[PDB]
From a paper:
Transcription factors (TFs) recognize specific bases within their DNA-binding motifs, with each base contributing nearly independently to total binding energy. However, the energetic contributions of particular dinucleotides can deviate strongly from the additive approximation, indicating that some TFs can specifically recognize DNA dinucleotides. Here we solved high-resolution (<1 Å) structures of MYF5 and BARHL2 bound to DNAs containing sets of dinucleotides that have different affinities to the proteins. The dinucleotides were recognized either enthalpically, by an extensive water network that connects the adjacent bases to the TF, or entropically, by a hydrophobic patch that maintained interfacial water mobility.
We first assessed whether differences in resolution would affect the detection of the water molecules using the two BARHL2–DNAAC structures solved at 0.95 Å and 1.3 Å. Although overall more water molecules are seen in the protein–DNA interface in the 0.95 Å structure, inspection of the water content at the site of the variant dinucleotide at both resolutions showed conserved positions of all of the ten water molecules, indicating that at this range, resolution does not substantially affect detection of water molecules contributing to recognition of the dinucleotide. Analysis of the highest-affinity complex, BARHL2–DNAAC, revealed that the high-affinity binding of BARHL to DNAAC is caused by a combination of indirect and direct recognition of DNA. Key amino acids involved in the recognition of the AC dinucleotide and its complementary bases are Asn282 and two threonines: Thr278 and Thr285. Thus, Thr278 orders water molecules in such a way that they contact both bases of the AC dinucleotide. The T18 opposite to the A7 of the AC dinucleotide is also recognized directly by a hydrophobic contact to the methyl group (CG2) of Thr285. In addition, the side-chain oxygen of Thr285 contacts N7 of the G17 opposite to the AC dinucleotide through a water molecule that is a part of the second water chain. Most of the low-entropy waters form a stable hydrogen bond network connecting the recognition helix of BARHL2 with bases at the TAAAC site, in good agreement with the water molecules observed in the two BARHL2–DNAAC structures resolved at 0.95 Å and 1.3 Å. The strongly localized and extensive water network that connects BARHL2 amino acids to the AC dinucleotide is enthalpically favorable for binding but entropically unfavorable.
Author numbering: 232 to 293
Write the structure that this text describes.
DNA sequence: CGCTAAACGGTT
DNA sequence: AACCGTTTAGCG
């Protein structure tokens, strides 16, 4: 049983990208604080940051 | 299709 | 526990 695909709001995407520009890796507390501010689950933030690092590494390589 | 969220098996 | 590298798949 797969989880439904989260559709992030524009506010959530803007805040996630502002976080990522500041810090490429978050502490457990910072990750939880971001999830709470955005009404997202801890896992959805953790997964967004992980996939964001994948995209970031792709862009670094060119 | 392209982007990207979630899942897999493996690593740190 | 979280991450990595990669895959799988949802959807505009």
């Amino acid at each position: 049983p797969r989880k439904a695909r989260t559709a992030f709001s524009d506010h959530q995407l803007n805040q996630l990208e502002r976080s990522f520009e500041r810090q490429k890796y978050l502490s457990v507390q910072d990750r939880m604080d971001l999830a709470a501010a955005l009404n997202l689950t801890d896992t959805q933030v953790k997964t967004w940051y992980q996939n964001r690092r994948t995209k970031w590494k792709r862009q670094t390589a060119v």
